[PDB]
PDB file of N, CA and C in Angstrom:
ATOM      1  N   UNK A   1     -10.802  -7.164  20.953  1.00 58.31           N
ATOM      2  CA  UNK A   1     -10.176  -6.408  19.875  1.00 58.31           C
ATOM      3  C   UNK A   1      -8.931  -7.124  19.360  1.00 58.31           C
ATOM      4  N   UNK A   2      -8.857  -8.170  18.547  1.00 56.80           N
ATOM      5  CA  UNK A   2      -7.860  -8.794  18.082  1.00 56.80           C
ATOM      6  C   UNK A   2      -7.614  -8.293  16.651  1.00 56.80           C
ATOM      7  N   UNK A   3      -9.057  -8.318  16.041  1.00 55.43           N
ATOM      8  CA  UNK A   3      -8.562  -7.493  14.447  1.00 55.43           C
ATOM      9  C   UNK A   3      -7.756  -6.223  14.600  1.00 55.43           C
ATOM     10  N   UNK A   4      -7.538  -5.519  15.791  1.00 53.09           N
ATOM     11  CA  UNK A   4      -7.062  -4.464  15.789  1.00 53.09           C
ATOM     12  C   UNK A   4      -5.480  -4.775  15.160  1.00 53.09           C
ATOM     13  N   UNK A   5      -4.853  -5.391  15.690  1.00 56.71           N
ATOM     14  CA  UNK A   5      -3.624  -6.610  15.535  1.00 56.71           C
ATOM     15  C   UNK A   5      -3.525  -6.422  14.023  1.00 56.71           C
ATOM     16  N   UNK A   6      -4.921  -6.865  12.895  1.00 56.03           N
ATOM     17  CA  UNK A   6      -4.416  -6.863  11.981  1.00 56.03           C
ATOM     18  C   UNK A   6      -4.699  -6.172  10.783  1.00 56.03           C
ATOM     19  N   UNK A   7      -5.422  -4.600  11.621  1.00 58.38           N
ATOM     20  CA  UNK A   7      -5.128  -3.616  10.546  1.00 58.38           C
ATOM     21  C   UNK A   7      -3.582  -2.980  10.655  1.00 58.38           C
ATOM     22  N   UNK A   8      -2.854  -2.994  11.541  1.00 58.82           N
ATOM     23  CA  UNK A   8      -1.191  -2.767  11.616  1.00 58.82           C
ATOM     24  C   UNK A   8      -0.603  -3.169  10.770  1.00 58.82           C
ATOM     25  N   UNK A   9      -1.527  -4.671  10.130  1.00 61.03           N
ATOM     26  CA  UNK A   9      -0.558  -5.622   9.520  1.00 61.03           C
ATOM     27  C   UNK A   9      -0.955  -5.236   8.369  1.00 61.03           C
ATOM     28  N   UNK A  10      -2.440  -4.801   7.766  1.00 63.50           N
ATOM     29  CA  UNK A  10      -2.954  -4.404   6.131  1.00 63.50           C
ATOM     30  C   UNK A  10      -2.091  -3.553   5.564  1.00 63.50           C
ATOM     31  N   UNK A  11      -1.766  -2.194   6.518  1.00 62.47           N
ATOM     32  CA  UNK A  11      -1.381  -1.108   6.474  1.00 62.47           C
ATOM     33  C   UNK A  11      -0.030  -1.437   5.297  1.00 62.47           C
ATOM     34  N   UNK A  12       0.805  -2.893   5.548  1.00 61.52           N
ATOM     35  CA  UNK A  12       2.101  -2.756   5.088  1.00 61.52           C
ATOM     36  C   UNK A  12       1.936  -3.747   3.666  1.00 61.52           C
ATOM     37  N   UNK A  13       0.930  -4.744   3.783  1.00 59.71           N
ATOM     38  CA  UNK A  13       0.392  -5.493   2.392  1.00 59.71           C
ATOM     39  C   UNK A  13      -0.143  -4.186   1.498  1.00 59.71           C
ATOM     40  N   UNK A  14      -1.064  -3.117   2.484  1.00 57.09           N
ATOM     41  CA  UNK A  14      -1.852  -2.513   0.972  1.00 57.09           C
ATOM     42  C   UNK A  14      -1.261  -1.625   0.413  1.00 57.09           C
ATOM     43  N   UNK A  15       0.045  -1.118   1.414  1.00 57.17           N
ATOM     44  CA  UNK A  15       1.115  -0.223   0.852  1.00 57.17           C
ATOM     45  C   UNK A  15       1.521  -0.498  -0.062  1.00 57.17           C
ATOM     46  N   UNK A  16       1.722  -1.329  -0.654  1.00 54.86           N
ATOM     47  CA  UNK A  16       2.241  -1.971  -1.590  1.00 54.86           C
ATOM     48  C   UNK A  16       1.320  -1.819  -2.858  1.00 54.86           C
ATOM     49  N   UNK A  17      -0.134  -2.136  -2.498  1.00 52.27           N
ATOM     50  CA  UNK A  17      -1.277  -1.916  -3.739  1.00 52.27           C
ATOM     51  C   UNK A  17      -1.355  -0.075  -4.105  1.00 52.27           C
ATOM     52  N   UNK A  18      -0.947   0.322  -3.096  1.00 50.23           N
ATOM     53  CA  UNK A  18      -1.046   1.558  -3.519  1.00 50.23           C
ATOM     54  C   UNK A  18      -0.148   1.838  -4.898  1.00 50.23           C
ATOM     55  N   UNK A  19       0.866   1.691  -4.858  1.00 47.82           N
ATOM     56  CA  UNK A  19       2.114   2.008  -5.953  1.00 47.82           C
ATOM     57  C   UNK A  19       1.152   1.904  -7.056  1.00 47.82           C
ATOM     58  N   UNK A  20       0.160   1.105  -7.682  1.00 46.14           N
ATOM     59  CA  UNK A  20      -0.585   1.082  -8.095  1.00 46.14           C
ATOM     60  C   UNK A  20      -1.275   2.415  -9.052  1.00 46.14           C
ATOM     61  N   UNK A  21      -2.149   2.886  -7.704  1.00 47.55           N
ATOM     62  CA  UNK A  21      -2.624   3.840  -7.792  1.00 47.55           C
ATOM     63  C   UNK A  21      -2.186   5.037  -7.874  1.00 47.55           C
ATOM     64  N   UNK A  22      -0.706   4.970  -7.443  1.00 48.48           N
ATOM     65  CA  UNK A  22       0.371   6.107  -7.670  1.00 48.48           C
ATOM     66  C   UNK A  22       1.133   6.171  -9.046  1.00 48.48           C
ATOM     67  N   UNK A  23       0.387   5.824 -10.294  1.00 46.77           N
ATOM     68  CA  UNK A  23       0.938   5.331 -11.411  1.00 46.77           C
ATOM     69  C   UNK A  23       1.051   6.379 -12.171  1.00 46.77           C
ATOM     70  N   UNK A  24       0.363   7.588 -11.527  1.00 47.13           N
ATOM     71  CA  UNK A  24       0.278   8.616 -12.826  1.00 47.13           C
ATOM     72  C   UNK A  24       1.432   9.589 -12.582  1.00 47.13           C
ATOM     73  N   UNK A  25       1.473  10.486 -14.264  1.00 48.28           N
ATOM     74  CA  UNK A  25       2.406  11.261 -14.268  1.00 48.28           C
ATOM     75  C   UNK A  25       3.116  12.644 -13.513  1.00 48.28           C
ATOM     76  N   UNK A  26       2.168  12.701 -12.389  1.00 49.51           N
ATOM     77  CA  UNK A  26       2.358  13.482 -11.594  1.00 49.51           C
ATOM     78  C   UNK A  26       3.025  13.229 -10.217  1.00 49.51           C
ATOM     79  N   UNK A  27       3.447  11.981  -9.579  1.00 50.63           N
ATOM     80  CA  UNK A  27       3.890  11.289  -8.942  1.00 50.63           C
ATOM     81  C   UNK A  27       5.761  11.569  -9.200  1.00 50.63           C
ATOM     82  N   UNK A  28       6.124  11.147  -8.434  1.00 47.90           N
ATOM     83  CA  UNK A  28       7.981  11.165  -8.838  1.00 47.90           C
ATOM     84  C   UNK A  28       8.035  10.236  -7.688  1.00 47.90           C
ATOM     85  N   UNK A  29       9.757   8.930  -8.842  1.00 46.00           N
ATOM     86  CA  UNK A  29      10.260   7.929  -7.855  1.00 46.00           C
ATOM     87  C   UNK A  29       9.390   7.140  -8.500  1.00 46.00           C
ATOM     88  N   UNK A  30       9.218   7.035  -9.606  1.00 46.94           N
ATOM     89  CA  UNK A  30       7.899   5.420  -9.975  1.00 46.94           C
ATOM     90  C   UNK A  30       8.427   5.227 -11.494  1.00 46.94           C
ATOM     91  N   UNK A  31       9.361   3.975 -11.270  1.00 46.62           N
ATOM     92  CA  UNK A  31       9.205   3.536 -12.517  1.00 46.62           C
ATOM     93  C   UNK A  31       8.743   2.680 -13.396  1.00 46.62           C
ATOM     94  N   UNK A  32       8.522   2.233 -14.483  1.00 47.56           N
ATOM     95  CA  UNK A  32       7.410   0.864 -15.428  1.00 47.56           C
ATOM     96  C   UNK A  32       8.325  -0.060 -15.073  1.00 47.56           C
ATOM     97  N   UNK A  33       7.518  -0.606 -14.583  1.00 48.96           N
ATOM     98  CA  UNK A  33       8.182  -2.570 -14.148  1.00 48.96           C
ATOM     99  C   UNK A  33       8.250  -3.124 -15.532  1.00 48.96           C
ATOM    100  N   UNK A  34       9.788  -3.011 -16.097  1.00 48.03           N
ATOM    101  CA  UNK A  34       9.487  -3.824 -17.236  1.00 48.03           C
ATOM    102  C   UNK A  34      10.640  -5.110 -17.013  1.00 48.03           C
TER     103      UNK A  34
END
């Protein structure tokens, strides 16, 4: 079990892809990257 190791590690890269998906107007704390 070594991949185990590196879903710990996805967890904090895909956090990041989420913001993403947290784009809509119902969300609060998100602003347009301009």
């Amino acid at each position: 079990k070594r991949f185990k190791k590196f879903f710990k590690k996805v967890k904090k890269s895909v956090k990041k892809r989420l913001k993403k998906i947290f784009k809509k107007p119902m969300v609060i704390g998100v602003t347009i990257p301009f």
